[PDB]
Structure 1
Amino acid sequence: IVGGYTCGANTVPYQVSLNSGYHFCGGSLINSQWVVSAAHCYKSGIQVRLGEDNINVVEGNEQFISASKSIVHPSYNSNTLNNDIMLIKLKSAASLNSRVASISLPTSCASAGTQCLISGWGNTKSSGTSYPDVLKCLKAPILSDSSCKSAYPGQITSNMFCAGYLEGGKDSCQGDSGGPVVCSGKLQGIVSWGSGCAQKNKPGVYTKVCNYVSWIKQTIASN
Structure 2
Amino acid sequence: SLCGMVWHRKGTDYHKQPWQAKISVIRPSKGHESCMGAVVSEYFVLTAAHCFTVDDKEHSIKVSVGGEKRDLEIEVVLFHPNYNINGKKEAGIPEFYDYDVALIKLKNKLKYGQTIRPICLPCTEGTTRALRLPPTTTCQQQKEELLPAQDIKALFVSEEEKKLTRKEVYIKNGDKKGSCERDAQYAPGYDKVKDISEVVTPRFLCTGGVSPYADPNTCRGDSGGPLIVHKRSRFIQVGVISWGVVDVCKNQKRQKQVPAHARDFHINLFQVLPWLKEKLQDEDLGFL
Please indicate, yes or no, whether the TM-score normalized by the shorter chain is above 0.5: yes
The whole-number CA distance in structure 2 between the counterparts of 1:89 and 1:118 is 23
Query: Which residue of 2 is the match for residue 47 of structure 1?
Result: 62
Runs of 4+ in 1 over 3 A off after TM superposition: 20-23, 166-169
- Show structure 1 runs of 5+ residues with no match: 1-6, 53-57, 122-130
SS in 2 for 1:175: helix
Query: Which residue of 1 is the match for residue 188 of structure 2?
Result: none
Query: Which residue of 2 is the match for residue 157 of structure 1?
Result: 201
Alignment counterpart, residue 13 of structure 1, candidates 14, 18, 29: 18
How far is the alpha carbon of 1:222 from its aligned partner? 6.6
Query: Which residue of 2 is the match for residue 127 of structure 1?
Result: none
Change (3 A) 1:222 1:98: closer
Tell me if the contact between 2:240 and 2:267 (Cα under 8 Å) persists in the aligned partners: yes
Tell me if the contact between 2:19 and 2:117 (Cα under 8 Å) persists in the aligned partners: yes
Alignment counterpart, residue 217 of structure 1, candidates 270, 274, 277: 277
Alignment counterpart, residue 218 of structure 2, candidates 156, 172, 189: 172
How far is the alpha carbon of 1:166 from its aligned partner? 3.5
The whole-number CA distance in structure 1 between the counterparts of 2:73 and 2:25 is 10
1:188-223 alpha-carbon deviations (Å, 9 max, x no partner) = 111111122352112111111111223112112379
Alignment of structure 1 residues 87-98 onto 2, 5 Å: 87-98=103-114
Alignment counterpart, residue 38 of structure 1, candidates 39, 44, 48: 48
TM-score, structure 1 as length reference: 0.80
The higher radius of gyration belongs to 2
Alignment of structure 1 residues 170-209 onto 2, 5 Å: 170-184=216-230, 185-197=235-247, 199=255, 200=259, 201-209=261-269
The question of 1:117 aligning with 2:132 is answered no
TM-score, structure 2 as length reference: 0.63
Alignment counterpart, residue 135 of structure 1, candidates 160, 164, 177: 164
Of Structure 1 and Structure 2, which has the larger fraction of its residues in helix?
Answer: 2
Tell me if the contact between 2:217 and 2:262 (Cα under 8 Å) persists in the aligned partners: no
SS in 2 for 1:92: coil
How far is the alpha carbon of 1:63 from its aligned partner? 6.0
The whole-number CA distance in structure 2 between the counterparts of 1:164 and 1:136 is 17
Greater RCO (CA < 8 Å, at least 6 residues apart): 1
SS in 2 for 1:152: helix
Which amino acid in the other structure matches residue 15 of structure 1? Answer: Q
Tell me if the contact between 1:30 and 1:104 (Cα under 8 Å) persists in the aligned partners: yes
How far is the alpha carbon of 1:137 from its aligned partner? 1.6
Change (3 A) 1:132 1:95: closer
Task: Count matched residues.
Answer: 200
1:160-210 alpha-carbon deviations (Å, 9 max, x no partner) = 111123366711112010101110321111111112235211211111111
Q: CA RMSD in A?
A: 2.4
Which amino acid in the other structure matches residue 18 of structure 1? Answer: I
- Show structure 2 runs of 5+ residues with no match: 1-10, 86-94, 124-141, 186-195, 249-254, 284-288
Tell me if the contact between 2:208 and 2:215 (Cα under 8 Å) persists in the aligned partners: no
1:21-54 alpha-carbon deviations (Å, 9 max, x no partner) = 58611001100000110010123323320101xx
The whole-number CA distance in structure 1 between the counterparts of 2:278 and 2:70 is 26
Which amino acid in the other structure matches residue 172 of structure 2? Answer: L
The whole-number CA distance in structure 2 between the counterparts of 1:17 and 1:99 is 13
